[model samples]
Target: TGCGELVWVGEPLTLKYGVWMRDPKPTYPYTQETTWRIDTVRQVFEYDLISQFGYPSKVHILPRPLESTGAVVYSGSLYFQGAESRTVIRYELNTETVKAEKEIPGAGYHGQFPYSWGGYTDIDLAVDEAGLWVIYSTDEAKGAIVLSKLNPENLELEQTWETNIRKQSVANAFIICGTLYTVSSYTSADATVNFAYDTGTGISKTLTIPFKNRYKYSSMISYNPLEKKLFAWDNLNMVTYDIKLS
Candidate 1:
């Protein structure tokens, strides 16, 4: 059978720019590196124009501020190591050149190596019936889950607090009926769903279910407020969860 090597993926499409990441873990004097990648097919072929946008940059695992460029259709954060405090410089892209549009100063843990632990990259954000939520931490020892109430239009921080039950590394977050549910890694066991309400002031529940391996790190949790439904990608399958909020 052709199933081993051939599968019906999707038709090819044209792309201009993309984003790449540099992962350097475990080294003396801290090995640092960076990467820059773009999405496209013709750009990879011979005699193609603008075919050199996929190069990589060196990055350090320490606290730093930077921005991801050449991602034409999307926005991302850049990591940079700073002298005193780590910074996360969010950027926006136009026809050319990435603009440093926003800044979250001192966003990194103070004097703590973010990558030293296994779950420092677990910070995630999602939008639900409550509002746009940014899940991050100010400390590393506890791995607290902090929620920030952001201004809908400007996306500025309105209020912030600590979620009591500090969780481990999380893969993705999905919402149902004004409640936040996340598929997270607990200790060393399988991934499970964690439910919270009103920013951890309400009841909490968790369900351990098998998830597709490919989608283990997916974080884009989309929901339809009108229909109370969730449409998410689970590796080879698109999973739909019934919210029934309406």
Candidate 2:
């Protein structure tokens, strides 16, 4: 094997508490990836690739509890905001360590501008076809949803966009193909992908793409590029909605 051995890591990892996954059909590349679950909010749990359920292969604790459901795993690391701070942190999975953490300038946190359902989730982390991103509001913008592209390694902002959309107006949002799309409701069975913001054009537009929350209590929504689907956590149910691409 060309894979190299471990050079050095921190002290031994301690245990913590618990935490979804792939589809039924087998797909290339994606079948190489694994699943992660954050059941009660802070603990990170990992399941093997091609797993259907039951137990996780591994579990680890976080440096800080998450503010809300806006956590993502990408490029072998986990990104999330601390429970009461505006600083975003990068936690490396294999080492069970905090690689880096940086404060978002003037950003709202700890419930100042969370989504409608409310969870102290002002700072939301997202990864798209582009790279790392963060969605939050600033005091200067008066509670509008401000978006920024972040350097995944150092948490430095590459660019920032200030949208007119209020942070609390929508339930949750996801980034797809360099564009930002937000869901309309968390409690409504009939919801829509009501807004789109393109980073390339630096503009916002209205859309009414119908979305559904069958369980009517969706706490998290994410777009998986590998699966071409939208994953939602509704009432405790893990569901994925397929997306049609051009």
Candidate 3:
């Protein structure tokens, strides 16, 4: 009765393959006052929650391109994988600095185990009620999905959990209440949340939660704690799914 599940999908917006989201729980000098969007995993654009992307209040061009579509905004920082590498980056919003970056030992990057839709979704960073996480596959794990809790301050690995789920088989994934959930298909209009892994119990379970791909090409998906929604990238559209936690 603690895990979260999607209950509804919001209307689609924008025409981009990446995602748009905001950090609900921010640090000093930062607030959940605006939203951020990304493209080609290089530039991050910011706009008011009620405003459209036509006019951005701020635009951040990353020092180096990101590895994939998996990026998370948490604690006033933008975390993404380094382009073509296993390194995780934490770019501060208010401080305007690359606070910390570290490589996940033996983590897969680039096209090693990409999501069904590709976009180099080999290393997906996520955020949830508990904290920061990264989903990837390692050679030693034989392409099985690997989840690791990360320290928001220095991107250090706190704990690791290995899953039997194959990374390339799932379209995208998100965490809620420290439980990892995977979507079965990115292009299927009617998809399913097929699997779950609880970090607390160190057990995996199968799920059949109904999921929709409004645009039929979701590239990334992540949980947003502020609104209790799944902010997703579908084709060129940005959409969200309302979630219910039991």
Candidate 4:
């Protein structure tokens, strides 16, 4: 028990929960009824099953059924969740390849934050003057947006950061020179604008605008280091605003 930690970053591509009824009273042979199903949509593609005992002879019987399914095809390049103990893979659309790069070993520090499917929405990877800022949003168990620093050169993690600030449904971060800037808004609204965190020594600011709009599942947030500003526009007329930095 080295780390004494149980953590999973992403939800399985597939997950299945099932139960069965067992019969212990044997006449000639035995009456055993088993039911099973397969789920291929889960990030892991897992199938689960269990069995229930019939009478006093058996009391209760539990068995997990495993079903093999087909592979799920996701489009273009994407960043999904995997196991900390398993190899982290990212798809490269340009080359139609899957690259095994980082072993997160859990999401945040001390396994506080676990990575799961649908946890990470849209991932942003851009090469700016400073270097390359790779950012993603995770809908953690605690509903928090956890950010990690990565070496764009190799898609490897460099540092990790987290904020208790109102959990964001989505996040878009930018690194200007050194400091990092981020903003959060659920669907879309003027008063909805809020600053999740700014690690930059420079002042990171949020300005409310009269953009009337909203979002359902995902929103779009982008960063512009050239202007040293963040653009948040979701659902609405796609009017991007420059988040004022302190």
Candidate 5:
């Protein structure tokens, strides 16, 4: 295929939603980083790292109710040599600035260096009608998933809870109506859906949705609370299903 210039994989898109992490440059002491929401259709809508907000170890596109408008959240604990702590930041596209930023309480030494293959301190971002949410677990509490709802405007922790679902081995997850839905990495062709955890009731149920093929390097999945749907891709094809909670 061709754009005004021919396009290829890995080529930057006019509009992209993700993080760019690079080795230290002359200006940055550590990794020079930036988070962006590139809007080619409307150039004025694009946004990049505004000031010294730091780079996210993991970032995700937080789709709002309006199809064309949404925000981005950065979730990770800072780590340099031995120092470790948690930081969560939100960027609203309309203002093009850091709307809210907060450090998780009781921060301390965490995560694995050389990085544990199956169990890295995975901190994922999700949003819904309530506000922004962060899903994470510590090195010691890898078996229990922590869900924290933050005030969308100031990034203040509004409510927090623990779920029975173990997140250390999850491939990916998303939030819907305050419930946490996860897809397992350990999957057989016939058994793919992993489990769903309801934050409100502290209950969880294992799920088994029919996923026939396992694609290599397929680890990303998403949910749209507005539509009550879940999405996944397996390199060759993309799939979606209406998620029902009973």
Candidate 6:
């Protein structure tokens, strides 16, 4: 999805937490037996969830446990990964509104893989100047990649293309202009910042950067059209680089 720019930055907010039993039993008393007269106590802990944004929160969009394959921020909005049967969704960032959108039908494409909770995969959500996109591979079992664009408002299928690259080629990606830039979660330092696929013209190439094995749990990589650069975090440092797609 398109990298969202700061609409505005206000004062920070500090949130608090409460306590709960981690190992509460299901039977009578619904508590575990303890020697210290503690009610089924496993452990007690609390932490602060701080944010710099105000209470303009979004709710009533998706059901409980908003887990999905991927998500992207675009145009001051949010898009969550839906079905691969050409279905997409758009959610209001400041409100509880949500709408379903369509995507270009691609056979073999599906939703997120089973039990892919933490592991990386080929199916991902991205954004660009055009709007929202769903990047996926049909034969990821064998390796294949596809890109589809959708309308920002209604999320109707607009265009589709094949990136000529396989699913296993790149770990994560984001669309900029018409090119798809990828970063490998597992790669040699010399190849950390390699791989670019242009969906418009169907061109795939490699661009090496000075880094080594910069793999992490879905490393954060985003594009900033305003700055005309990419903000990505490697292993130790956050990098800002201009992508010469021209």
Who wins the lDDT comparison? Answer: 3
Cα lDDT over the full model 6: 0.46
Instruction: Output the number of the TM-score-best candidate.
Output: 3
Flag regions of model 4 displaced more than 4 Å.
1-94, 108-144, 168-188, 201-213, 224-246
User: For residues 1-246, what per-residue lDDT tens digits would candidate 3 score against the true structure?
Assistant: 555444434443443434667786866564566778786558898776434546777889887887766788888899988887888989997667999989898987778888776667788888888889998899999998999999999988999999979988887778888888887875565678899888888888888877766644536777777677777766466667777766
Model 3 TM-score?
A: 0.87
Please, what are the lDDT tens digits per residue for candidate 5 over residues 41-98? 1222212344534433333333221111112332221111111335554544333454
Model 4: ten consecutive residues of lowest lDDT: 3-12
Model 4 error, position 17 (Å): 38
Residue 224 C-alpha lDDT in model 5: 37
**Model 2 bad stretches (over 4 Å):** 1-31, 185-187, 215-218
Ranking the candidates on lDDT from highest down gives: 3, 2, 6, 5, 1, 4
- All candidates: TM-score: 0.45, 0.82, 0.87, 0.40, 0.55, 0.58
Please report, in order, the local distance difference test score of every candidate based on alpha carbons: 0.36, 0.71, 0.77, 0.33, 0.43, 0.46
Q: What is the lDDT of residue 72 in candidate 4?
A: 12
Better of 5 and 6 by lDDT: 6
User: Which residue pairs come into collision in candidate 2?
Assistant: 19-39
Per-residue alpha-carbon lDDT of model 2 for 67-171, expressed as tens digits? 776777777778888877888899987788899899999998887888777776688787766778898899998998899999988889999999878878888
Kindly give the number of clashing pairs for every candidate: 14, 1, 3, 26, 0, 5
In candidate 4, position 230 carries an lDDT of 35
Any runs in candidate 1 off by more than 4 Å, and if so which?
Answer: 1-121, 175-178, 185-192, 200-215, 234-238
Poorly placed runs, candidate 3 (over 4 Å):
1-18, 48-54, 215-218
Superposed by TM-score, candidate 3 places the C-alpha of residue 242 at a distance from the truth, in angstroms, of 1.2
